Amino acid sequence: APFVCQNNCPGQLFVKVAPNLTNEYDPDASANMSRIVTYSDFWWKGKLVFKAKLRASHTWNPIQQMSINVDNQFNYVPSNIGGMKIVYEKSQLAPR
Amino acid sequence: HLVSFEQEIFNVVLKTVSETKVYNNDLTASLMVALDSNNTMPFTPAAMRSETLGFYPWKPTIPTPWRYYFQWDRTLIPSHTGTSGTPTNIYHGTDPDDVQFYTIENSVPVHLLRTGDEFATGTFFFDCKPCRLTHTWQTNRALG
Amino acid sequence: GVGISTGTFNNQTEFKFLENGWVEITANSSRLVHLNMPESENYRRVVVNNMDKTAVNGNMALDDIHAQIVTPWSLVDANAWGVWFNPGDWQLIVNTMSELHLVSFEQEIFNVVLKTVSETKVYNNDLTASLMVALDSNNTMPFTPAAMRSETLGFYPWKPTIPTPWRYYFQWDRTLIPSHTGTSGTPTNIYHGTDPDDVQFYTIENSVPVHLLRTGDEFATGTFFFDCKPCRLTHTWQTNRALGLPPFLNSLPQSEGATNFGDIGVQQDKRRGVTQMGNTNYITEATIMRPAEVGYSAPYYSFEASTQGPFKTPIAAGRADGNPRYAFGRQHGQKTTTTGETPERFTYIAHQDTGRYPEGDWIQNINFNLPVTNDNVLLPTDPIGGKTGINYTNIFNTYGPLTALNNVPPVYPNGQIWDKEFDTDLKPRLHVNAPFVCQNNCPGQLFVKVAPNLTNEYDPDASANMSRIVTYSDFWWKGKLVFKAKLRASHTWNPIQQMSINVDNQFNYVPSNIGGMKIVYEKSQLAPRKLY
Amino acid sequence: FNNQTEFKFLENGWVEITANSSRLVHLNMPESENYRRVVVNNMDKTAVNGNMALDDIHAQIVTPWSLVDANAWGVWFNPGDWQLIVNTMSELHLVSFEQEIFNVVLKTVSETKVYNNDLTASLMVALDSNNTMPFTPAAMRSETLGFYPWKPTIPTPWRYYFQWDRTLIPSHTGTSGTPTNIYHGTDPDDVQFYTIENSVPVHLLRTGDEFATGTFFFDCKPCRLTHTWQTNRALGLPPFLNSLPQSEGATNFGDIGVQQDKRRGVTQMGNTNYITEATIMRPAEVGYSAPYYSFEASTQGPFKTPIAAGRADGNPRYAFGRQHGQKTTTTGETPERFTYIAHQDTGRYPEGDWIQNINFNLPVTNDNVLLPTDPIGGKTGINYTNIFNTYGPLTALNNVPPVYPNGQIWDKEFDTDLKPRLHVNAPFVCQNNCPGQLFVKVAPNLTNEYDPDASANMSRIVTYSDFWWKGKLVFKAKLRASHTWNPIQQMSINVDNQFNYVPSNIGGMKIVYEKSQLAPRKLY
Amino acid sequence: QKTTTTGETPERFTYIAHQRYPEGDWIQNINFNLPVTNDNVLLPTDP
Amino acid sequence: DPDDVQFYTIENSVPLLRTGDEFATGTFFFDCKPCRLTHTWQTNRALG
């Protein structure tokens, strides 16, 4: 990663479904618990916040930059049957 | 820089399946949720197994089924193809004085969420140094 | 909780006759709106190519090629007069008002209900699941007025409504070279190209915030205020001959009968006056100067081509060869008990007399012989380019610094109310499609989508989309469009034209008690207005 | 001296660009102090039949002054800075402009040659803060101050058009005789002779003193660094596709559902039923067909009727020299040239234009349609799309992009009562008043041999000057945002274009055209 | 990966980050015989 | 290589003199750790 938390990081978030125990089960059984077929779905939301410094031009020459071109164009729009992709993108472009 | 982070889980629904299949709601049972707020459990991000939440907004996602990697004892002497015989390749179990067992239910508080309530991770903050999105070409030949 | 409804149905439109000759018209409206789930949640890029009907020569106008991003969301668009005012209201406003403004607009969704299908089909409420709703309050999405396809909400209060599935244009290249029946060349027609310069893929989920409603809570767009210019409910009759002072008459008709006429006494070259003919002495009403030109001629049935294919050049006014033609279905005014697929159709023959008559006009040489020889005059029947049916008026254009024009009239029920300004640096002077143009921003388009009601069958790896429980939603939309309008006046001695229920048209309004209703079109501009 | 550019940041995402530019400026004394009324001619070439387009006849007042003009982009921004301006920002406004001049030098030549110092004499300078002199922007002739800081540059000798009368009746190859091709002199009512000496007060400068302006403040409306891609066909709501595809691959097109004559919608023209994407009503018109390569005759001879946006025709072609961006190591006199194929889709494509008769019988027959293939006036080349004009009240246009480095920045609004809606040459047009031009001249080092009775030019010692110049030009601009899931186009250094931006072995340099309006914008 | 492809094969890539060359360097004897003799230099070619 | 290009000029980056006038810098201050003249006596043979 580019960042590492020195003291501590944000907490690890765990989720589990409480058992829908059937009436036939009781704890004296040796076998695994008999449950009703159950599933849960939920909506998640979060907000990372970054601080960033806008660059400034110090060379005379223009720097390399990330750009759509004729070749890579269709990577960034869906297909007929609803496909999507996310092609990788380089991340330390400007010459220091 | 990293500055702040938060989460919330909201608009929960729990459901059950009746056998064709028919789909029904649940309200008495709960979605169990726990936040390891002090990094007590072994720190194990999902990118190691490549199972973080999906990247497209307009699609459901699955959370990774969690496991943590235990203590164990094993030896393997190297060899290369064309060598005769078989190397010493044995598993020995565990060092019981280094073994540790972790469980959520005694390590972390649990919220029994239901179809009607939220859980909100508090606004965390970071101490991270500047990342710098630029690169250097100068080798040792190009110094001075 | 679930048990309590939240909002009240209301179509009761009311007239507040405020002070000093202005009336504030609160067009409340309400409908029941029915959504099915999307066909699939994935955004699809689709491209259409009717090579079949446009490989045949001479079918240049039939072209339908385009690309569009078929989108899971649906659009709830009220931008049509029929959604707001009933025929009694329109009778009133056209007969009694002169000028009209657009003040403010509001929306709220309430009483949302969501249902799923279980085995014949048996239907139940899913009290836990959700409807997604999203307002583009900043107009980040491209403006897509549904009236141009007759896809607004339905114009009847009592009958339910279905909202249009949303889609928007995505850039394409095409050249279609024209050809006639009997051209050998088999012209170039190539369906392909998207430039990287121009790609714009917009998604609701990223571009705007979204609310996840449940059966029990409401969404309300706050009061958005328009800024627009006035619209005139009155029409101008003076084409250029009827402007200014008429000539003086020396011999008035002595009889009462219309078969006799009055005479100018002074011979045509002895007359006084001002002219725009530097080398000719005759003064005649076809030649006397006038302050400026009313109306403008334009090349009629001109198609022109830019990067995205050929298109019809719009014209600001008509004399039918320029007046708009409308087409619409059961939900928008066709007699609802009719079988069959053919949309009802009308052409709005506007009363605005500032049109042109391309069989009436000619050009003649600067020497200006009065009895023109054939070589010194270009009649509208003469060929151009050797073609027999094409004449000079098809190429002609008189638009100038001098040409005055009226705005497009309202048209009831199928016409638009508002449109958005083009984001060009140089703005056009009028819009052919709507009377009012939002200068700053238009009201946010409102989008809706049944929240995915997943089965237990979803995974990261499945190539197929998620296995959806078949789910549908019905919600009660309510809108409040507030107009402001001045009352008419009575300058003339003799009464203006007014809308009325003449005995023949009567049973186009009162319900054909077999079950049907219709909504016949009404002229919007009735009274005359003096131009100069 | 300064040539740094500073990007100060303001509240809410505006940015202020303080562009500094400085130069070492060289000026020889005039050939003569005589104002000259020169009539200029190419009589034989324009009198050969068919050569009307090359008609150069004009009259001008040659002046004993030079013009210091900073009115082009390359004076102020370098390729590195222009990248950041183009690719991060959506809108741009001019704020303010000032000049100042410093470290004047003044010398004479004597006889190898000895280059004397002449601290006694003076350099002559005139700031036209009163906007008296007719505006004569050097960008159109590629004569601005040079687009590099380091090497010196020369200010161009100044001149302005006099009035003239000319007629040139056109004729084709093989027409009989020579058509009426005459210069009729000038009308007395139109005459305008100006002199700097009675238009502007003149400062005298020496080695040891300096000059500075006040800050001109601009009133201009925004230029946009983004382009509109939608034409008429892409406005509004697409038709609903009843039969969506079932496979990937471009061969699997989608099919709009119900037949042509039975679809719903609105059409502007209505004697026939068909609602199609060509015929569906759209809110307005983007662009317009201008009559292409129309030349019109004035009192002062023929001229090209300009066009608002191009599709090559109508797109601007710049010709420029070594001081303004041609590779300075080159020898010879052929100027470098580029045609700026602008990004805007506001143009028009004449080969797809067609007209058809009112009746609209659907598969059209030859006698009821007019095509670009078809003659007008018997001329087998010229077709109706040349004489066509569809400027109308519904036409909408986008002001001209910036052209870097040769393009002009600001330009003056014409004094006419009815003013044009856009200018062809400059993105910004200044309404109330415009930057005062700056003129420079060298005072005569008269010989002792001068007297007023001699009718030849005044005898002078060979004199020349150089001086350092410093302009400061301030812009305000707005930063863009990620309105869309895809990345936009951007300017970049790549394997092919890298050597354009870095010097040669001899240390010469070049500057290459950078497409400005580079990000897409939602039109409707 | 393309959401609509079938199959179990993952998509792979490597980050050629903008920023050693083992084939291009050597270790030699301290005495520094400039036209170096075989025994006095160790090269990447050498087993 | 195109990513690596860094062309610089004094005139475009950095902010005149004659006989009888002068130039001066601002006064700089360092924050370096001190240099020391001590001799470490432990060697490959001598340790502890």
Q: What is the 3-state secondary structure (H, E, C) of C444-513?
A: CCEEEEECCCECCCCCCCCCCCCCECCEEEEEEEEEEEEEEEEECCCCCCCCCCCCCCCCCHHHHCCCEC
Measured in whole angstroms, the distance separating CA F30 from the mean position of its chain's CA atoms is 10
Which residues in chain A are contacts of D252 at CB distance < 8 A?
A: 80
Option in F2, F4, F9 nearest A60 (CB) = F9
Report yes or no: D238 and D280 within 8 Å, Cβ to Cβ. Answer: no
Secondary structure, 3-state, D3-24? CCEEEEECHHHEEEEEEEEEEE
Structure tokens at F43: 């060697």
CA atoms within 13 A on the CB side of B75: 5
CA distance D220 to D409: 11
Phi/psi for C269 (5° steps) reads -90, -15
Name the residue among C302, C323, C178 with its Cα closest to residue D289. Answer: C302
Under 8 Å CB-to-CB from C382, ≥6 apart: which residues? C391, C392
CA distance D172 to B114: 89
Name the residue among D276, D294, D290, D280 with its Cα closest to residue D392. Answer: D290
CA distance D466 to D26: 4
Option in C194, C212, C456 nearest A39 (CB) = C456
CA distance D419 to D414: 6
Q: For residue C81, what are the CA distances in angstroms to C77, C84, C152, C154, C156?
A: 12, 6, 10, 11, 12
Region label for D314, one of left (φ > 0), alpha (ψ between -120 and 50) or beta (otherwise): left
Binary contact (C465, A69; C-beta < 8 A): no
CA distance A35 to D398: 67
CA distance D256 to D260: 10
Name the residue among D435, D412, C439 with its Cα closest to residue D420. Answer: D412
Name the residue among C97, C229, C101, C227 with its Cα closest to residue C529. Answer: C97
Q: For residue E27, what are the CA distances in angstroms to E20, E45, E46?
A: 15, 12, 11
CA distance D427 to B64: 56
Q: What is the DSSP letter of C207?
A: H
Q: What is the DSSP letter of C402?
A: T
Judging by DSSP bridges, how do beta strands D58-68 and D89-110 pair with one another? Answer: unpaired
CA distance D142 to D338: 13
Name the residue among C113, A38, C459, C112 with its Cα closest to residue B13. Answer: A38
Phi/psi for D500 (5° steps) reads -65, -30
Give C179-194 as a DSSP string: --BT--S---EE----
CA distance D302 to B87: 97
Helix, strand or coil, per DSSP, at residue D87: helix
Binary contact (E15, A85; C-beta < 8 A): no
Rg of chain C on CA atoms, in Å: 28
Option in D80, D245, D487 nearest A81 (CB) = D245
Neighbours of chain F (3+ CB pairs under 8 A): A, B, D
CA distance C77 to B141: 67
Mutate to test the interface with D, among F11, F14, F21, F23 (most CBs of D within 10 A): F11
- Count interface pairs C-D at CB distance under 8 A: 396
Binary contact (B59, E3; C-beta < 8 A): yes
Report yes or no: D476 and D24 within 8 Å, Cβ to Cβ. Answer: no
Under 8 Å CB-to-CB from C249, ≥6 apart: which residues? C262, C263, C264, C265
In sequence order, what are the beta bridge partners of D117?
D107
Measured in whole angstroms, the distance separating CA B62 from the mean position of its chain's CA atoms is 13
Which residues in chain B are contacts of E3 at CB distance < 8 A?
A: 56, 59
Report yes or no: C316 and D393 within 8 Å, Cβ to Cβ. Answer: yes
Burial call D109-124: b when 16+ CB within 10 Å, e when fewer: eeeeeeeeebeebbbb
How far apart, in Å, do the first and last CA atoms of chain C sit?
64
Which residues in chain A are contacts of E13 at CB distance < 8 A?
A: 88
Name the residue among B113, B130, B107 with its Cα closest to residue B43. Answer: B107
Look at the block and give the residue holding tokens 């618990």: A33
Q: What is the DSSP letter of D157?
A: E
Report yes or no: D442 and D123 within 8 Å, Cβ to Cβ. Answer: yes
Residue D225's domain spans which residues? 1-524
Resolution number, Å: 3.6
Report the gap between the CA of D394 and the closest CA in chain C (Å).
5
Residue C515 sits in a domain whose CATH number is: 2.170.30.10
Give B61-128 as a DSSP string: --PPPP------EEEE----TT-SS---EEEEE--TTT-----HHHHS-EEEE-TT--EEEEEEE--P
Cα angle at C402 between C397 and C408, to 5 degrees?
75
Rounded to 10 degrees, the C-alpha dihedral C32/C37/C43/C48 comes to -80
What determination technique applies here?
cryo-EM
Which residues in chain B are contacts of E18 at CB distance < 8 A?
A: 135
In sequence order, what are the beta bridge partners of B106?
none
Under 8 Å CB-to-CB from C40, ≥6 apart: which residues? A82, C72, C465
Structure tokens at D426: 């400059």
Phi/psi for C206 (5° steps) reads -95, -30
Structure tokens at A5: 């938390």
| Residue B111: other Cβ atoms inside 10 A | 15
Phi/psi for C89 (5° steps) reads -60, -40
Binary contact (C42, E3; C-beta < 8 A): yes
Helix, strand or coil, per DSSP, at residue A73: helix
Q: What is the DSSP letter of D374?
A: S
Phi/psi for C349 (5° steps) reads -80, 90
Report yes or no: C297 and C480 within 8 Å, Cβ to Cβ. Answer: no
Report the gap between the CA of B127 and the closest CA in chain F (Å).
25
CA atoms within 13 A on the CB side of C219: 22
User: Positive or negative, the Cα torsion across B8, B13, B15, B20?
Assistant: negative
Name the residue among D238, D394, D240, D364 with its Cα closest to residue C61. Answer: D364
**Are A and B touching by the rule of 3+ CB pairs within 8 Å?**
yes
Q: For residue D497, what are the CA distances in angstroms to A38, C313, D501, D519, F2?
A: 61, 42, 8, 20, 9
Binary contact (D4, F16; C-beta < 8 A): no
Number of domains in chain D: 1
Structure tokens at C138: 């900043």
Strands (E), C59-154: 66-70, 74-76, 97-118, 122-125, 130-135
Under 8 Å CB-to-CB from D140, ≥6 apart: which residues? D408, D425
Smallest CA–CA distance from B14 into chain C, residue:
C128
Region label for D425, one of left (φ > 0), alpha (ψ between -120 and 50) or beta (otherwise): alpha
Under 8 Å CB-to-CB from C232, ≥6 apart: which residues? C98, C99, C100, C406, C407, C525, C529
In sequence order, what are the beta bridge partners of C213?
C131
CA distance D434 to D410: 8
Residues in chain D: 524
Which residues does C contribute to its contact with E (CB < 8 Å)? 42, 461, 463
CA distance A74 to A68: 9
CA distance D371 to C325: 26
Phi/psi for B76 (5° steps) reads -155, 110
Q: What is the DSSP letter of E33?
A: -
Cα angle at C449 between D247 and C170, to 5 degrees?
50
CA distance D54 to C95: 64
Q: For residue D454, what are the CA distances in angstroms to C157, D46, D72, D445, D450?
A: 100, 39, 43, 17, 8
Helix, strand or coil, per DSSP, at residue C87: helix
Report yes or no: B36 and A11 within 8 Å, Cβ to Cβ. Answer: yes
Look at the block and give the residue holding tokens 């025994």: E39
Q: For residue C272, what are the CA distances in angstroms to C176, C250, C264, C283, D301?
A: 56, 14, 12, 7, 37
How far apart, in Å, do the first and last CA atoms of chain E sit?
42
Phi/psi for C471 (5° steps) reads -140, 145
Report the gap between the CA of C118 and the closest CA in chain B (Å).
7
Residue D294 buriedness (CB in 10 A; 0-12 / 13-18 / 19+): middle
Strands (E), C329-470: 344-347, 363-364, 377-378, 403-404, 418-420, 436-438, 446-450
Under 8 Å CB-to-CB from C72, ≥6 apart: which residues? B58, C38, C40, C41, C42, C43, C449
CA distance C208 to C446: 11
Measured in whole angstroms, the distance separating CA C309 from the mean position of its chain's CA atoms is 22
Binary contact (B136, E17; C-beta < 8 A): no
CA distance D472 to D470: 7
Which residues in chain F are contacts of B137 at CB distance < 8 A?
A: 1, 3-4, 6
CA distance D81 to D20: 12
Burial call D399-408: b when 16+ CB within 10 Å, e when fewer: bbbbbbbbbb
Look at the block and give the residue holding tokens 């009781």: A26
In sequence order, what are the beta bridge partners of B31?
A17, B113
Judging by DSSP bridges, how do beta strands A94-95 and B134-135 pair with one another? Answer: parallel
Which residues in chain F are contacts of D495 at CB distance < 8 A?
A: 2
Region label for C60, one of left (φ > 0), alpha (ψ between -120 and 50) or beta (otherwise): alpha
Neighbours of chain E (3+ CB pairs under 8 A): A, B, C
Report yes or no: C47 and A84 within 8 Å, Cβ to Cβ. Answer: no
**Are F and C touching by the rule of 3+ CB pairs within 8 Å?**
no
Judging by DSSP bridges, how do beta strands D36-40 and D58-68 pair with one another? Answer: antiparallel
Rg of chain E on CA atoms, in Å: 23
Q: What is the DSSP letter of D83?
A: H
CA distance D244 to C46: 8
CA distance C122 to C135: 33
Binary contact (A82, E2; C-beta < 8 A): no
Give 3-state DSSP helix, strand, coil % of chain E, rounded to 5: 15, 10, 80
Asked if the bond preceding C209 is cis, omega within 30° of 0, the reply is no
In sequence order, what are the beta bridge partners of B12?
none
Structure tokens at E18: 């903008």
Under 8 Å CB-to-CB from C408, ≥6 apart: which residues? C316, C430, C431, C432, C433, C434, C435
Binary contact (B136, E19; C-beta < 8 A): yes
Measured in whole angstroms, the distance separating CA C112 from the mean position of its chain's CA atoms is 31
Phi/psi for A41 (5° steps) reads -135, 145
Report yes or no: B15 and B28 within 8 Å, Cβ to Cβ. Answer: no
Region label for C481, one of left (φ > 0), alpha (ψ between -120 and 50) or beta (otherwise): beta
